[PDB]
């Protein structure tokens, strides 16, 4: 789906009801989308434009103040796992 | 006729008013034994007529006071 569309003036929300070609907008919702995804029109010819995935470099570690936050530790960093391409979790 | 009770005069230490007691021989719900279930009503009447211990016909009427909402019809069985 496409839930809501926003023009995003530096993390400010104004509502867009229709998007044209060549404009930047934010689509709200979109459960399974990743970086550089080629969103195309279904029931129509399907296109592709994506070819790049950059490098990771330095891997460190962490351990929280207690074990009661470990479920949030995998969740909140998992919340950060969806965001950045060059940021992995082991 | 109309809805009228029998009662018994209890507290007549006041003016133009009476608290009557009416007996209800109800059946207990679970144990089947009849209990003398009392019921006390602030009942309005006319100018100070009777004393304690006399059966008194009383009917429902307007809420004449905060609590008094019944009217004494007549006094039966004057005793000592």
């Amino acid at each position: 789906r496409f839930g809501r569309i926003v023009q995003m003036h530096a993390n400010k929300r104004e509502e867009i009801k229709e998007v044209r070609a060549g404009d930047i907008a934010a689509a709200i919702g979109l459960k399974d989308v990743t970086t550089g995804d080629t969103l195309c029109d279904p029931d129509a010819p399907i296109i592709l434009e994506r070819m790049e995935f950059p490098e990771p470099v330095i891997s460190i570690a962490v351990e929280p103040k207690t074990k009661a936050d470990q479920e949030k530790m995998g969740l909140a960093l998992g919340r950060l796992a969806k965001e950045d391409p060059s940021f992995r979790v082991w | 006729k109309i809805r009228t009770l029998q009662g018994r005069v209890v507290s007549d230490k006041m003016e133009k008013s009476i608290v009557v007691a009416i007996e209800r021989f109800v059946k207990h719900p679970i144990y089947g034994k009849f209990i003398k279930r009392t019921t006390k009503l602030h009942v309005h009447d006319e100018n100070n007529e009777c004393g304690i211990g006399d059966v008194v016909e009383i009917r429902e009427c307007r809420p004449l006071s905060k609590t008094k909402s019944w009217t004494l019809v007549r006094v039966v069985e004057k005793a000592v």
């Binding site: 207690t66 074990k67 009661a68 470990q70 479920e71 | -």
Partner: protein
């Protein structure tokens, strides 16, 4: 409270978010609950092909 650790070979420790279901462990005085294996940080039993709905062992692949 206390609780019993069913099966054998548990990887439990000083702090572990676990799950608890009630049940008398009669031979043990004053222990009234059972840790349900198949839950959180108390993992499944090292291979047990019989009665695996309790102890939370999955079905072997085939």
């Amino acid at each position: 409270v206390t609780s019993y650790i069913g099966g054998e070979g548990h990887n439990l420790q000083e702090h572990s978010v676990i799950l608890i279901r009630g049940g008398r462990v009669k031979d043990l005085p004053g222990v009234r609950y059972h840790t349900v294996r198949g839950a959180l940080d108390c993992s499944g039993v090292k291979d047990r092909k019989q009665a695996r709905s309790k102890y939370g062992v999955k079905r072997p692949k085939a």
